[PDB]
Design a protein around this ligand. Structure first.
Ligand SMILES: *[C@@H]1O[C@H](CO)[C@@H](O[C@@H]2O[C@H](CO)[C@@H](O[C@@H]3O[C@H](CO[C@H]4O[C@H](CO)[C@@H](O)[C@H](O)[C@@H]4O)[C@@H](O)[C@H](O[C@H]4O[C@H](CO)[C@@H](O)[C@H](O)[C@@H]4O)[C@@H]3O)[C@H](O)[C@H]2NC(C)=O)[C@H](O)[C@H]1NC(C)=O
Ligand SMILES: *[C@@H]1O[C@H](CO)[C@@H](O[C@@H]2O[C@H](CO)[C@@H](O[C@@H]3O[C@H](CO[C@H]4O[C@H](CO)[C@@H](O)[C@H](O)[C@@H]4O)[C@@H](O)[C@H](O[C@H]4O[C@H](CO)[C@@H](O)[C@H](O)[C@@H]4O)[C@@H]3O)[C@H](O)[C@H]2NC(C)=O)[C@H](O)[C@H]1NC(C)=O
Ligand SMILES: *[C@@H]1O[C@H](CO)[C@@H](O[C@@H]2O[C@H](CO)[C@@H](O[C@@H]3O[C@H](CO)[C@@H](O)[C@H](O)[C@@H]3O)[C@H](O)[C@H]2NC(C)=O)[C@H](O)[C@H]1NC(C)=O
Ligand SMILES: *[C@@H]1O[C@H](CO)[C@@H](O[C@@H]2O[C@H](CO)[C@@H](O[C@@H]3O[C@H](CO)[C@@H](O)[C@H](O)[C@@H]3O)[C@H](O)[C@H]2NC(C)=O)[C@H](O)[C@H]1NC(C)=O
Ligand SMILES: *[C@@H]1O[C@H](CO)[C@@H](O[C@@H]2O[C@H](CO)[C@@H](O)[C@H](O)[C@H]2NC(C)=O)[C@H](O)[C@H]1NC(C)=O
Ligand SMILES: *[C@@H]1O[C@H](CO)[C@@H](O[C@@H]2O[C@H](CO)[C@@H](O)[C@H](O)[C@H]2NC(C)=O)[C@H](O)[C@H]1NC(C)=O
Ligand SMILES: CCCCc1nc2c(N)nc3ccccc3c2n1Cc1ccc(CN)cc1
Ligand SMILES: CCCCc1nc2c(N)nc3ccccc3c2n1Cc1ccc(CN)cc1
Ligand SMILES: *[C@@H]1O[C@H](CO)[C@@H](O)[C@H](O)[C@H]1NC(C)=O
Ligand SMILES: *[C@@H]1O[C@H](CO)[C@@H](O)[C@H](O)[C@H]1NC(C)=O
Ligand SMILES: *[C@@H]1O[C@H](CO)[C@@H](O)[C@H](O)[C@H]1NC(C)=O
Ligand SMILES: *[C@@H]1O[C@H](CO)[C@@H](O)[C@H](O)[C@H]1NC(C)=O
Ligand SMILES: *[C@@H]1O[C@H](CO)[C@@H](O)[C@H](O)[C@H]1NC(C)=O
Ligand SMILES: *[C@@H]1O[C@H](CO)[C@@H](O)[C@H](O)[C@H]1NC(C)=O
Ligand SMILES: *[C@@H]1O[C@H](CO)[C@@H](O)[C@H](O)[C@H]1NC(C)=O
Ligand SMILES: *[C@@H]1O[C@H](CO)[C@@H](O)[C@H](O)[C@H]1NC(C)=O
Ligand SMILES: *[C@@H]1O[C@H](CO)[C@@H](O)[C@H](O)[C@H]1NC(C)=O
Ligand SMILES: *[C@@H]1O[C@H](CO)[C@@H](O)[C@H](O)[C@H]1NC(C)=O
Ligand SMILES: *[C@@H]1O[C@H](CO)[C@@H](O)[C@H](O)[C@H]1NC(C)=O
Ligand SMILES: *[C@@H]1O[C@H](CO)[C@@H](O)[C@H](O)[C@H]1NC(C)=O
Ligand SMILES: *[C@@H]1O[C@H](CO)[C@@H](O)[C@H](O)[C@H]1NC(C)=O
Ligand SMILES: *[C@@H]1O[C@H](CO)[C@@H](O)[C@H](O)[C@H]1NC(C)=O
Lengths: 750, 750
């Protein structure tokens, strides 16, 4: 039987049951399911009958029920003897639920209203490994200080991760187990760390003390400093027996002085986070740095002195002792000029590959200095002032910075990367890139550049392979633009509409043909509608063209023949994106002039009232056809005559009200047909009557206004007989009529 | 009886019947209707019965039927003895329809397939005043040269306007009537104008010869030059008896020489259009200019020499004879520098108020020169390179330029206007605005400006009253910004999100309180989510704040109290726009802190699941409440208790499925209720049972999924009894169920 209301799969056997507007635990969950995701529903009661039929359950996710809190009886879960992981986040629970199964290894109660951690709630959960209680009382929420019963955690002798961040604690809890590997005490209003607080935790590898005595100036949240904005006070012997520490987080602890003796017995420390402190003085002196010869990542971001814009950054000679350093983050220091000598102390560090100076309002850099480093791989300078050379917070993320790569992994994969995005290099003059390493990945996005590139600007870094020029005002008025970069493989010119949008200025895209290695070109959002002299794009190498957000409705206007072969000269093209081009119809001859090598064609989010399915005959390699978001009415009845390659056909958000006799099971090759959000009232006997067989494995139908009379029987019957063809989200495959069926699944009817 | 399918009104009595998917002329049009708009439908046949019941018809509009052309029998209109205006544009008519009523004064057949203008079609329409036949054969359309029967127009002795633009004619037609005031022959492929062509047209006030021998380089359409790109050839005596000419259009006629003798007998010429020619030489010499002392508007745009970027513009001394000149357009000449002396010849012209140098790639201007003009009002410099001081075409519009004002009328209404938008004044230094007139309207939009304004930058033009700073990268980091402009009434800071989006930099909006005359402030699209030190906006004058496209979901996050009074200090505010702020709910206390002076509140296009209607009690002046585009489910049953001011309530695009008993006719004051595109299945007896009376005059209901059973009877009955309450577009107030009603109007059912 086709499972309902959950979607299932085998991975442990997972029941996807999230976000289906369920009002209670469905009683119809499969008895082989090991993992049950019921998150984001409208469930209000959990009782001992809620999971009665499901003792193979090892993982239950009830996060965010309902969307006025979640009501859980004493020992509602007690009979699930195999339950290991119970997620109850964001449920407005007033208490730890009573009578939780002793088999629990993972319990998350993040984002609730729990101000009392009790022996009765917890001390019997002796198998706990990971306990999350964070974000229960914080900011300006109306809540109580957290009462932690003396010794509530001491019985949990296999506990490896304890998180109590974003609660009011005032003190580190006594009687923590020595099994701890990771202790999260961020934003807990603890002012003082004594010798006793951590003395027993010889297995700790991570300690997070960030946000206690925070630095509150310009904070993007409600922020309460320690009296007189004082530092956190950490006893000299506080970290004495923390010999296995790898991660230390002291962001926003208002630190002015770092005690070198803190690091004495921490030979393995790998990642040290010191953001949002007052360490300008310490960065210039930094005795503690001599204690950290294994440190790989040091984050000193946002240590700026309120109100100062000094000329230069001052880095201690002691940075030269950070022998293992791989990345240094120095965002938000704030300074005017970077000179070669200012970074002398970093230049011999053999593994320093990332230097991050984002958001420093830097006006001038002595570029030649970077090449004197051993080998930088990522020279991140985004969001400065370089100019021509002359609940709101994700509880499961990092709070103090974004976790994403600095440079797009696709670009950094080519080699050495320089990101000068979000500056003011509004004009690249003859000497701008002198004395740089062999840059492979260059980001010049959002530099207000309005120049006419002409074939010489990048001559001093001629091996750039991935060039990001997005979001400038580039004037493409010279056929030699960018031709100096003969290794260029990826070129992104997105959002340079400034001059293209003006009909009366000239526009030249002829340089595209000059590249022998160009694979991917992005011309998106350029409002391209007129070119000068040469009307066609030509490349013998190009594999992918993104032409979304242009004016193909104008270029292919029925009265104009000039752009009828605009893409034909792209002899190697396999992927073409023509979304967002306002197209009502594509002239037959223009469609036939698309590259016959295409395997993937997107024409989604236009206004197509017409598609000539017959022309698919000229595309024997076409596998994916994306026509989502149009106004199409008519499906051909003879698709198998027109293609034997097409594997995925996407037609959601159209106006199809009729599937033709023997439509699906038209093409052997068709695996995925998406017909969601169309105007289907019914699917007939004959529309699926084609046999045999179907390679069809997915058919999406949600969002159609189905008429649920006996006329739905043949499709319902079809569904039972083709359990191999997955129909997702049956909860949303809904009857629009008649009145008494309105709102029900089509699957729920006699 | 409530009219259907057309909407009616009294103005002549107009039946709005356009764009309703009508498949034929409805037989149910009211017999008092004088004007019938049936444009943009799917009508395919017009016969003699089509209007049988409607002899009061003076105006019929059939433009764009259908959306495979329009089929019109011989004399289908002949019985409409009062028909004066017949619009048949865009209908794919192969011929002038036969047997048109002799009462016609206006006939438009623009955008058809008519290549034959015949005596049989036309010569009897002796009352014609305006005849439009333009855009039948043009560009790369597959079409025939136009055959104009000898003397087909000579019988039409009251013809005042003839348009044959965008057809292939090759020759000016002989035997035109001398009644002509306006003759449009643009893009007609006429190469030669002889002495005879116009000799009889002594009433002509406008002649359009543009686009014959066009200048084709970089044209945004299919463009065919005259042999060897030669000029149009105009006989010396071609304009000899055109003594009443006011308008002359010779754009894109490939002119290199203007014959002064052409203007000899044209003492009234007012507007002369010479765009897209080759007149750089003529502009530097220009004997013809001495012949035009009454000319008010001269357009010499786009006369650039292909490939040249000269240093300076060269204006003949003879420009000083254009005594009447009011506006001079010199876009697209192309030059580097503007010096004081280059415009000497314009400086004594007493009425020259507009100078337009858009799109010249000008790098440097000697600003002091403008003040030496008699009185410029509009100094338009948009789209240059100034930097810190050191069917596609609308047939009813102008083809060669846009018709809209150069400067927004709201800004130009304050006084002298300087538009420096779309340049590169990326930093306003101490001297940038020295030696300018008293500028009231300043446009600095899209200059890539990333400076920290600080209270001195505009000191040399301190009486700016309307300042457009949109689309820059402004760093609002100083509380004194803009305070030098103490007369400022309108300030537009839209699309300056660059720094606001960065949490870790400081942000200051305190300057807002410093203005005693500030009326309108636009902070749209700034991604505002965090401010430094001061969390509130304060002004004792501000009447209108646009805060759309910001992050009030973040500012008003339930755990943060800091922005709970963000708008309260706007003591004078009557209009507040909080659209596009991602709001799920507004905290009660934040809503109550909105200015009590509001008369107009927009919270449309958010994600509101909740609205506290009770809080409307604190807004006794509130008249318009806009909550369109949300996810609201719940309408209060007691609105009259909460407001007696509200006149317009907009709730389209929500999820309302229930109107409460005695809802509408809740508030006496409510005139306009918009409930379109919600989830109403029915409207009950009791929902409208409130009596008496209703000031309700509009109720929008289209787009609801109405259940058309007998349960719709009470509303249908209600509609008959309240003919005063207009329900628009009944065609689109449609039954969703049951099956046999699906698609019908609710008004069409037993
Ligand atoms: C103070 O500084 C320390 C750094 O020393 C920070 O510690 C990190 O805290 C974050 C957030 O709380 C932790 O990140 C989360 O880790 C979860 C577990 O990851 C482990 O398991 C996976 C495989 O399951 C491994 O790949 C991984 O390396 C670990 O072994 C992840 O499951 C989380 O990801 C999930 O949620 C995020 C939500 O955004 C999604 O983006 C993910 O795609 C996925 O759904 C998340 O990555 C992190 O592990 C901690 N570091 C360490 C070393 O333990 C503190 O956060 C910082 N304090 C503050 C307040 O900022
Ligand atoms: C060569 O140069 C001449 C200028 O000398 C141009 O002539 C103009 O041509 C345009 C477009 O064809 C005409 O503009 C249209 O005029 C219609 C009639 O306007 C009269 O009536 C109204 C009141 O009814 C008065 O306000 C007005 O001043 C006139 O008395 C308008 O109805 C049109 O507007 C309608 O359509 C446009 C479509 O975009 C809408 O925007 C409007 O809101 C409205 O729906 C339109 O304004 C213009 O009148 C001609 N000028 C003269 C003086 O006659 C040629 O166009 C140019 N040739 C080419 C090819 O560019
Ligand atoms: C311009 O278009 C280019 C090319 O399409 C865009 O880059 C491409 O972005 C897509 C995602 O939009 C990347 O694909 C994704 O990559 C990840 C990682 O492998 C994968 O998990 C996803 O399933 C998906 O495949 C693709 O790699 C990337 N290609 C390149 C060459 O970088 C680019 O983002 C566009 N520019 C702008 C401003 O939108
Ligand atoms: C920033 O918001 C300002 C103020 O709301 C915007 O200006 C205003 O724009 C509206 C139209 O959006 C103008 O109202 C319209 O004016 C015409 C002419 O009277 C009228 O026909 C319309 O019915 C409507 O009233 C309004 O006058 C104008 N106000 C001012 C002071 O200029 C401005 O456009 C916004 N900026 C951006 C970039 O969106
Ligand atoms: C070039 O720099 C721009 C701006 O820093 C990067 O744009 C960011 O891209 C990421 C992922 O694509 C988005 O999450 C950010 O929102 C973007 N930021 C902005 C301000 O646009 C771009 O990714 C960088 N290019 C490369 C190749 O790494
Ligand atoms: C300031 O200059 C900008 C750019 O020229 C003007 O923006 C144009 O505004 C009109 C009507 O608002 C739109 O039709 C155009 O699309 C806009 N163009 C662009 C490129 O944004 C703006 O209107 C000018 N400001 C004033 C006060 O006149
Ligand atoms: C990481 C940034 C921290 C705070 C900050 N915000 C800004 C900002 N929005 N614009 C600036 C522009 C130039 C220099 C510094 C800042 C700045 N800064 C540093 C700063 C330096 C100096 C002053 C004025 N005394 C104010 C601010
Ligand atoms: C009204 C404009 C007409 C054609 C044009 N288009 C452009 C353009 N896209 N960028 C320019 C940038 C600087 C100078 C001139 C142009 C230019 N120009 C003028 C121009 C001048 C000079 C040259 C190169 N010989 C090419 C083009
Ligand atoms: C949970 O349900 C029980 C009904 O047995 C009730 O007594 C209790 O008040 C409920 N909790 C909430 C928050 O309503
Ligand atoms: C480096 O640290 C040592 C402690 O080992 C300290 O005494 C010295 O002054 C530091 N160097 C500088 C330049 O401050
Ligand atoms: C630098 O990195 C490599 C790992 O690729 C490691 O073998 C080497 O020991 C490192 N050198 C230092 C000083 O840490
Ligand atoms: C492009 O500019 C270069 C250098 O500025 C110039 O030599 C050349 O004439 C231009 N190229 C073309 C094809 O116009
Ligand atoms: C680019 O290619 C074209 C045509 O193949 C050639 O004429 C041109 O000189 C090339 N330009 C450069 C700068 O390599
Ligand atoms: C065509 O694309 C493939 C895949 O990128 C590449 O191997 C080949 O070199 C390209 N062909 C040409 C002629 O550039
Ligand atoms: C589809 O394309 C073929 C080839 O251009 C043409 O013969 C046929 O008429 C087209 N069909 C439609 C409906 O336009
Ligand atoms: C118009 O209708 C008549 C039917 O009387 C038919 O003869 C004629 O062919 C029709 N025109 C078109 C274009 O179909
Ligand atoms: C101005 O026009 C006259 C004709 O009246 C002509 O002879 C004279 O040369 C022109 N002036 C200039 C500077 O060319
Ligand atoms: C200038 O404009 C005014 C109209 O306001 C008019 O009275 C005056 O005669 C004009 N002067 C000339 C030389 O045309
Ligand atoms: C703003 O800048 C001005 C001039 O640059 C400076 O005097 C002042 O200190 C700044 N104002 C504030 C309020 O910080
Ligand atoms: C602006 O107003 C504030 C408060 O009313 C005042 O303190 C400040 O000095 C004013 N600034 C200027 C530049 O007028
Ligand atoms: C309030 O607004 C009105 C209308 O703009 C204006 O007349 C009045 O001057 C403003 N009040 C104050 C105190 O600025
Ligand atoms: C609506 O507002 C009033 C005043 O804040 C409050 O008493 C009431 O509880 C609110 N209603 C809802 C449904 O939140």
């Amino acid at each position: 039987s086709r499972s309902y209301p959950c979607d299932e799969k085998k991975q442990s056997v997972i029941a996807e049951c999230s976000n289906r507007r369920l009002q209670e635990v469905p009683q119809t969950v499969g008895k082989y399911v090991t993992e049950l995701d019921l998150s984001d529903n409208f469930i209000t009661h959990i009782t001992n009958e809620s999971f009665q039929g499901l003792q193979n359950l090892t993982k239950i996710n009830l996060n965010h029920n309902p969307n006025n809190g979640l009501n859980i009886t004493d020992g509602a879960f007690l009979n699930l003897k195999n339950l290991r992981e119970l997620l109850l986040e964001d449920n407005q629970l007033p208490q730890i639920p009573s009578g939780l199964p002793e088999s629990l290894t993972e319990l998350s109660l993040i984002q609730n209203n729990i101000y009392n951690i009790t022996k009765e709630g917890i001390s019997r959960l002796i198998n706990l490994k990971n306990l999350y209680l964070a974000w229960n009382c914080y900011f300006n929420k109306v809540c109580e200080k957290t009462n932690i019963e003396d010794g509530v955690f001491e019985t949990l002798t296999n506990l490896e991760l304890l998180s109590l961040s974003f609660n009011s604690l005032s003190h580190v809890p006594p009687k923590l187990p020595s099994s701890l590997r990771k202790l999260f005490l961020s934003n807990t209003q603890i002012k003082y760390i004594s010798e006793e607080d951590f003395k027993g935790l010889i297995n700790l590898t991570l300690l997070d003390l960030s946000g206690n005595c925070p630095r509150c100036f310009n904070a993007p949240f409600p922020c309460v400093p320690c009296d007189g904005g004082a530092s956190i006070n950490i006893d000299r012997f506080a970290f004495q027996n923390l010999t296995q520490l790898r991660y230390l987080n002291l962001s926003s602890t208002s630190l002015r002085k770092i005690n070198a003796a803190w690091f004495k017995n921490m030979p393995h420390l790998k990642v040290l986070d010191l953001e949002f402190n007052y360490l300008v003085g310490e960065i210039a002196s930094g005795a503690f740095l001599t204690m950290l010869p294994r440190l790989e990542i040091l984050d000193l971001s946002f240590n700026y002195i309120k109100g100062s814009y000094p000329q230069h950054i001052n880095i201690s000679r002691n940075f030269s002792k950070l022998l293992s350093l791989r990345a240094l983050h120095l965002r938000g220091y704030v300074f005017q000029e970077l000179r070669e000598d200012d970074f002398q102390p970093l230049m011999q560090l053999p593994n320093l590959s990332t230097i991050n100076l984002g958001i420093n309002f830097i006006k001038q850099i002595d570029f030649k200095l970077f090449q004197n480093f051993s080998n930088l791989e990522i020279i991140y300078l985004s969001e400065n002032r370089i100019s021509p050379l002359v609940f709101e917070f994700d509880p499961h993320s990092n709070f103090y910075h974004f976790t994403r790569p600095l440079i797009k992994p696709q670009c950094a994969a080519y080699g050495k990367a320089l990101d000068l995005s979000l500056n003011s290099i509004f004009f690249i003059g003859p000497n701008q890139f002198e004395n740089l390493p062999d840059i492979a990945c260059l980001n010049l996005s959002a530099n207000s550049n309005a120049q006419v590139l002409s074939g010489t600007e990048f001559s001093a870094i001629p091996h750039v392979k991935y060039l990001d020029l997005t979001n400038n005002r580039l004037d493409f008025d010279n056929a030699s633009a960018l031709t100096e970069l003969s290794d260029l493989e990826v070129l992104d010119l997105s959002y340079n509409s400034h001059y293209f949008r003006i009909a009366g200025v000239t526009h030249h895209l002829e340089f595209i043909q000059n590249f022998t290695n160009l694979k991917v070109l992005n011309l998106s959002h350029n409002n391209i509608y007129t070119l000068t002299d040469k009307y066609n794009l030509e490349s013998k190498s190009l594999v992918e063209l993104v032409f979304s957000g242009n004016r193909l409705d104008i270029l292919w206007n029925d009265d104009d023949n000039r752009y009828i072969s605009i893409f034909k000269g792209l002899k190697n093209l396999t992927r073409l994106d023509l979304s967002l081009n306002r197209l009502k119809h594509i002239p037959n001859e223009a469609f036939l002039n698309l590259p016959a090598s295409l395997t993937e064609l997107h024409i989604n989010d236009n206004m197509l009232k017409f598609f000539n399915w017959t022309l698919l005959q000229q595309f024997p390699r076409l596998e994916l056809l994306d026509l989502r978001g149009n106004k199409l009415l008519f499906l051909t009845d003879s698709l198998s005559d027109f293609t034997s390659s097409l594997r995925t056909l996407l037609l959601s958000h159209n106006r199809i009200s009729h599937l033709p006799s023997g439509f699906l099971s038209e093409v052997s090759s068709l695996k995925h047909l998406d017909l969601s959000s169309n105007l289907l009232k019914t699917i007939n006997k004959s529309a699926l009557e084609t046999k045999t067989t179907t390679k069809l494995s997915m058919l999406e139908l949600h969002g159609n206004p189905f008429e649920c009379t006996c006329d739905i029987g043949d499709f319902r019957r079809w569904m039972d007989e083709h359990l191999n063809v997955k129909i997702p989200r049956l909860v949303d495959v809904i009857c629009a009529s008649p009145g008494d069926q309105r709102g029900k699944s089509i699957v729920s009817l006699e």
